[PDB]
Design a protein around this ligand. Structure first.
Ligand code: CL
Ligand code: CL
Ligand code: CL
Ligand code: CL
Ligand code: CL
Ligand code: CL
Ligand code: CL
Ligand code: CL
Ligand code: CL
Ligand code: CL
Lengths: 328, 328
């Protein structure tokens, strides 16, 4: 029994590079009672991994989630054939004792792709859902600003806000991505890389200002948004992608007189806070809404486990339209 | 009747200097029916005036609150001799229609100075009260970080926090202020100017982190504190005084990966949000606590209305121990 695994050969300095990763082949032990051998079917790459990777030692396996098939079982809860979510990292095969795994929703249809369990009806959809519904606390009627809005979190956020009856303003890094989010029914979408002035564009997009800001990117982009927040505006801090790969100091912060005069609430959050019933209800909603056509999905599938570092690097550069997913 | 008024001659570049202010003498109109003539007894200077003054046109009067006596009345609610809070700016005499004024508390004793109405039992005490009890929402048993902690706002925050059963860690700018706050019963107090490393002082002062941070200073000081916040820690953003007089770009914002990881809540506030009964219950709670000795106060009184800019500059530059009042 053999496995292939991507390790961190070297801590990243700015953007990752091929030389910071190393593929190692390895013999997997035999199964003890209560254990299963899992075969990776679909592996995800996500922005957080740029950040989570600083917590690793050189030689450690890259963290990450997958959809795996149980190929060998000594666990009666999980027979051969069973499909599960698992986070053994960037690895083709892994041994699990059962207790770190998740079967899919019972009601899960054959008419949707299994890899949605890693996207829209998985962790990024849950991030959108809870960030928007619990942290921004949108009610309906509100004007929501969402950035990295063609990203896996962003695009779900906007689609949930539309079906709660909000105006949604979305910012995007490419013109393919602009067209895509207009198909999905966002009120105003623009390419931030091409606009002459973010300030003027955001002003023309909601002259009123923004009730809510779902922030994925941070930096000077967020400083500009903060200057057009309505009084008692709410900000959900989900990520700061524009900062993860920097080589210098952080940009200036939110201009503090504006934050104070406007009495803003900013609250940061991580998806994993919500477990139990709250989480299962959220998943079931994301499933409902997908099947009703209220949330549309798109995937960028890269064939082959050899191509994972490239998938990650591509996603980080903004090269891909859809959730990046490696088939394997 | 004449008045003297301090105007903004020139917009401040970094700190103010004397030449940015101009004293003018002006004749006042006779009173119409329902109006009163106010003579200033005590005027305040406050950090926010540095920020607010950026919104003035040159020639404009400096903004600010005072304790004033009604010396001429055509208003039956406000007979000669009545003491009021008023905000005509930095002027010795002004005219009111009476509807923008505030009489002192009914139960206001002779055994305290009138000028506490501009400080501890006034705007800065209210700032502390609501920032701490509503925004930080301290319940008791929590460790509170307060900066500019021997200032008008910070010293009250610390004393209310003590009396609600919190550990209080205060940062201060002089060793006289360190001494003073230790007499007031703060748990840890230090001089942020003398300490070798802020990071390490905060780490020894609360090994377990900070539940709440009442933030008056902002900038790099705050970035260091954020690195020490407990998970789900609460920041009340009240001011950012370290930035008001700063001549360059703003310093690096708070490090987003830590904010997100710790799921921090930051909320900005202005005192004038709380009005009506809530505001009155707070003024009565503050005055009660003063009489009981649970809140001590220190004033730095400066004689003469012509000394008001120097007073302001001395306040901004950390010159003084106690609330800066001009008699006036
Ligand atoms: Cl078993
Ligand atoms: Cl099988
Ligand atoms: Cl995007
Ligand atoms: Cl963007
Ligand atoms: Cl993605
Ligand atoms: Cl009258
Ligand atoms: Cl009189
Ligand atoms: Cl300080
Ligand atoms: Cl101080
Ligand atoms: Cl003061």
């Amino acid at each position: 029994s053999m496995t292939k695994t991507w390790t961190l050969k070297k801590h990243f300095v700015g953007y990752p590079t091929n030389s910071d990763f190393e593929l190692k082949t390895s013999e997997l032990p035999p199964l003890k009672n209560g254990e299963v051998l899992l075969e990776a079917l679909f592996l995800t790459v996500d922005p957080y991994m740029r950040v989570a990777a600083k917590r690793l030692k050189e030689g450690d396996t890259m963290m990450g989630q997958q959809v795996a098939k149980v190929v060998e079982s000594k666990n009666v809860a999980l027979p051969k054939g069973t499909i599960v979510l698992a986070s053994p990292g960037w690895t083709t095969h892994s041994i699990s004792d059962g207790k770190d795994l998740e079967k899919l929703l019972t009601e899960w249809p054959d008419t949707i792709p299994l890899s949605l369990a890693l996207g829209t009806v998985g962790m990024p959809g849950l991030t959108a859902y809870f960030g928007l519904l619990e942290i921004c606390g949108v009610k309906g009627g509100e004007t929501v600003m969402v950035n990295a809005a063609a990203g896996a979190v962003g695009s779900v956020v906007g689609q949930i806000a539309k079906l709660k009856g909000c105006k949604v303003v979305g910012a995007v890094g490419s013109d393919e991505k602009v067209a895509y989010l207009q198909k999905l029914g966002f009120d105003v979408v623009f390419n931030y890389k091409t606009v002459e002035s973010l300030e003027e564009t955001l002003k023309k997009a909601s002259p009123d200002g923004y009730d809510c800001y779902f922030d994925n990117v941070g930096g000077e982009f967020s400083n500009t948004v903060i200057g057009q927040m309505k009084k008692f505006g709410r900000i959900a801090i989900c990520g700061a992608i524009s900062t993860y790969n920097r080589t210098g100091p952080l940009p200036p912060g939110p201009p503090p007189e504006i934050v104070i005069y406007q009495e803003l609430r900013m609250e940061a959050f991580v998806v994993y806070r919500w477990q139990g019933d709250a989480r299962q209800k959220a998943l079931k909603d994301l499933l409902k809404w997908v099947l009703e056509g209220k949330i549309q999905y798109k995937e960028y599938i890269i064939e082959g486990f050899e191509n994972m570092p490239a998938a990650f690097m591509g996603m980080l550069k903004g090269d891909n339209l859809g959730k990046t997913i490696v088939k394997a």
